[PDB]
Amino acid sequence: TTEIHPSCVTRQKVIGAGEFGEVYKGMLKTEVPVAIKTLKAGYTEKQRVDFLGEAGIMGQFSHHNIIRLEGVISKYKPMMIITEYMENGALDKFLREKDGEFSVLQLVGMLRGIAAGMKYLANMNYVHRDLAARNILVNSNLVCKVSDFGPIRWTAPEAISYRKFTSASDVWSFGIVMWEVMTYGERPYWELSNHEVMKAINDGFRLPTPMDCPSAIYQLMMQCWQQERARRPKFADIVSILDKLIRAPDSLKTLADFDPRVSIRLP
Ligand SMILES: Cc1ccc(C(=O)Nc2cccc(C(F)(F)F)c2)cc1Nc1nc(N2CCNCC2)nc(-n2ccnc2)n1
């Protein structure tokens, strides 16, 4: 990681909360807009270990679809993690505010980017545990980048049941993200309670197809939701399939049947 001097950082707006400090939007000089997570006076030993350990892991990552670390302030207080700023913000909110505005190819391109970032993380032996559209950031080129903190509806059964978090439970979450993207940010399982979601999944029910969804994309998300973890595709399989669908875009024209809930009779 690069050490940044505090005189190069201006905090402007609070945009979130950290584990022991705030997250700001600001500017970095060397101006470029940045996001800034602070660790404030009184933090514990464990919090400092986790904060600097987070900075270190982010510093190791170098991938188009992973949020970029600009640097760290560790020699002065408050300590800070400084990342690039993504002006379109979080993917879940972004899609909900732009309902129906994108082509199928654009949406699938988003998913290919997320999958490539996740393939990289899994290969680097990083298990995310919290993959969801709320943790994806979108830039002004529509590039999606994975982010993380320092979620029953998104979590694979074995991770809920016995705390087995692996890249294969991240694949389950990726399937949910696919459904979030294709529905423009609909809440998975709608108003079902957490217990009702787990009961439905255990009974074998799965989320139905989104409207206007390519058959190939629904098939892929369904295979991410296999109960047996070993049967789920790996991220390499997901990236390969999405890349081939994008490169032969007529493949996306065949749509899965949408189960209408409302039927209107007109002559
Ligand atoms: C300052 C900051 C510090 C750390 C991280 C971060 O990602 N650490 C991380 C740790 C482990 C693994 C991964 C890995 F995923 F990469 F693997 C990533 C992101 C940001 N910066 C930042 N964080 C968020 N969020 C919101 C959603 N929840 C996550 C944090 N949003 C924005 N942001 C919003 C608009 N423009 C920018 N910036």
Side-chain angles (χ1 to χ4, degrees):
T1 76
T2 307
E3 185 79 18
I4 291 170
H5 191 268
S7 68
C8 295
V9 181
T10 309
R11 288 177 269 164
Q12 290 163 321
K13 183 178 179 180
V14 177
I15 67 172
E19 287 73 33
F20 201 89
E22 288 66 45
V23 184
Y24 301 78
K25 188 260 178 211
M27 302 301 299
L28 173 66
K29 286 157 150 147
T30 284
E31 299 202 283
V32 309
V34 290
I36 305 149
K37 182 156 84 168
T38 65
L39 196 71
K40 300 287 180 33
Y43 59 81
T44 63
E45 174 170 30
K46 184 53 190 333
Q47 287 166 335
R48 176 261 299 165
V49 165
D50 288 347
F51 185 86
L52 295 189
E54 169 175 10
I57 284 159
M58 302 176 70
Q60 200 163 331
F61 299 152
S62 181
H63 191 278
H64 186 235
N65 300 104
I66 302 297
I67 186 178
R68 176 174 64 253
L69 177 71
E70 302 290 331
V72 300
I73 300 187
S74 65
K75 299 177 176 189
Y76 302 89
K77 305 303 172 73
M79 303 199 300
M80 302 189 180
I81 297 167
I82 305 170
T83 71
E84 68 183 320
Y85 187 71
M86 314 263 297
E87 184 45 67
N88 287 316
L91 177 64
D92 63 333
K93 194 178 200 290
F94 174 82
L95 285 187
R96 290 168 195 153
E97 297 175 359
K98 285 151 207 318
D99 188 31
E101 295 182 25
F102 301 120
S103 69
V104 177
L105 197 57
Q106 283 173 310
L107 298 173
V108 176
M110 312 186 92
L111 294 171
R112 184 180 51 188
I114 298 158
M118 288 310 302
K119 179 191 185 178
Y120 178 76
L121 291 179
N123 288 345
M124 299 289 287
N125 203 24
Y126 184 75
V127 178
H128 190 294
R129 308 185 166 216
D130 304 281
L131 175 60
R134 67 177 160 282
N135 281 325
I136 305 300
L137 299 170
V138 185
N139 74 12
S140 68
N141 286 347
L142 215 60
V143 175
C144 290
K145 300 199 187 192
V146 186
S147 71
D148 204 348
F149 323 101
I152 287 292
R153 282 166 215 267
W154 281 266
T155 300
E158 70 276 7
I160 298 163
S161 291
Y162 59 102
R163 317 183 156 98
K164 182 46 166 161
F165 283 89
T166 65
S167 299
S169 57
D170 282 348
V171 163
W172 182 288
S173 312
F174 181 82
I176 306 290
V177 174
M178 294 178 70
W179 192 90
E180 291 186 280
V181 167
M182 301 313 292
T183 63
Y184 287 89
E186 277 200 81
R187 175 159 190 85
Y189 313 92
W190 301 278
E191 81 279 359
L192 284 200
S193 69
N194 285 342
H195 191 268
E196 287 161 351
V197 170
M198 292 179 289
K199 175 60 165 161
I201 292 299
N202 204 227
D203 292 342
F205 293 100
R206 297 294 188 265
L207 285 168
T209 177
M211 199 172 329
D212 293 333
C213 187
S215 171
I217 295 295
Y218 189 60
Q219 293 177 56
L220 180 62
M221 69 180 83
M222 280 290 284
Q223 288 170 79
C224 295
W225 302 326
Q226 287 262 41
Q227 175 71 29
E228 191 185 338
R229 145 179 60 78
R231 295 191 185 130
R232 291 172 210 154
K234 314 305 180 187
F235 279 116
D237 301 314
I238 295 167
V239 170
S240 177
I241 288 168
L242 293 173
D243 194 55
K244 291 171 173 182
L245 291 168
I246 290 170
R247 290 165 72 168
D250 289 349
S251 69
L252 295 170
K253 299 296 183 181
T254 296
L255 306 181
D257 187 40
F258 176 75
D259 282 338
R261 257 179 305 255
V262 192
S263 210
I264 307 292
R265 313 181 179 251
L266 285 170

